[PDB]
Homo-oligomer: A and B are copies of this chain.
Amino acid sequence: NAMRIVVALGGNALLRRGEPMTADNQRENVRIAAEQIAKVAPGNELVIAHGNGPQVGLLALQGAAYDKVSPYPLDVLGAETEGMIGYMIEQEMGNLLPFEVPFATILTQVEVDGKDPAFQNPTKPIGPVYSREEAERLAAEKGWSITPDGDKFRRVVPSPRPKRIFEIRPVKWLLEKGTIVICAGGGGIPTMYDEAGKKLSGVEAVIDKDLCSSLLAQELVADILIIATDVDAAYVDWGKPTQKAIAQAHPDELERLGFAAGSMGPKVQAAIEFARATGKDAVIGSLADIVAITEGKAGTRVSTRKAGIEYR
């Protein structure tokens, strides 16, 4: 019967490559996604999470360009994207479903660990491209880490693992009343305790939206985690006469085949973590197939329920 579903929307689901980060461009993509997601809303308990790459990136560019006031830190920018994106998802979904279906967009703080190795190895580029001269000045003045970007440079920030989502109880209480809940936007607002474990503060970082959605689905006791991506499945023998879509795979087999690395690595790693932690299923696939995904008829289902690998 009913299932509790966490759907993690990909970044490309809100803005495609090659189009500017405008409200109009985002809304038309959100409308397409909402039309697809709404097909699995009736009778179910639906949580929608999403990325925020282009959105938080633009806020960083606009703040860096504006010299009259010192721009907000990255955690605060994350919070702003949760408002911007969540608003659009809620409004588009509400235009599709019976108005009796309640909606809530919840700001989501996510604790990260101060000892996370990501803080010694920042990886996520953000902000404008700087000359060597300006990148040097900013590193010395602000303590920023940078990465080469061609013959220029860009700031990079840590991407630590999510450790706990603060607002789990409110989300559960809303789902129990039939609410569709939008949360963990952008992977959540990254927050961290001081050494004493007494005071929570923001931290300048991003959280991977699929790892956060996996944690969210674990903490919400979801029945299924759906990692929505452009591709309709993971494949073996990709680009070869023996190319085959993976219908279902045990985490042990996915790791042996090398799927925890590559371009799909982070999504496979998040699906594996959910499957191992819960004994429930994570499915990597397309929003266009979301009904079939919930029926076990599409997507790559990552589960410990059955060892080995099954194709379709």
Contacts and interface: CB of A to CB of B under 8 A. Distances in A.
Contact of A169 (B68, B82, B177, B191): B177
Contact of A200 (B23, B61, B95): B95
Q: What is the oligomeric copy number? A: 2
A70 interface: yes
A contacts with B: majority SS: mixed
A83 B198 CA distance: 24
Contact of A174 (B20, B70, B103, B174): B174
Contacts of A91: 109, 191, 200-202
Contact of A66 (B66, B75, B166): B66
Interface residues of A, number: 53
A81 interface: yes
Greatest chain B CB density within 10 A among A73, A81, A95, A104 is at A104
Nearest to A82: B83
Given A20-B69, A87-B202, A95-B198, 7 more contacts: A62-B66, A65-B66, A83-B84, A87-B109, A87-B189, A102-B169, A169-B179
A90 B201 CA distance: 11
A105 B107 contact: yes
Greatest chain B CB density within 10 A among A61, A63, A82, A179 is at A82
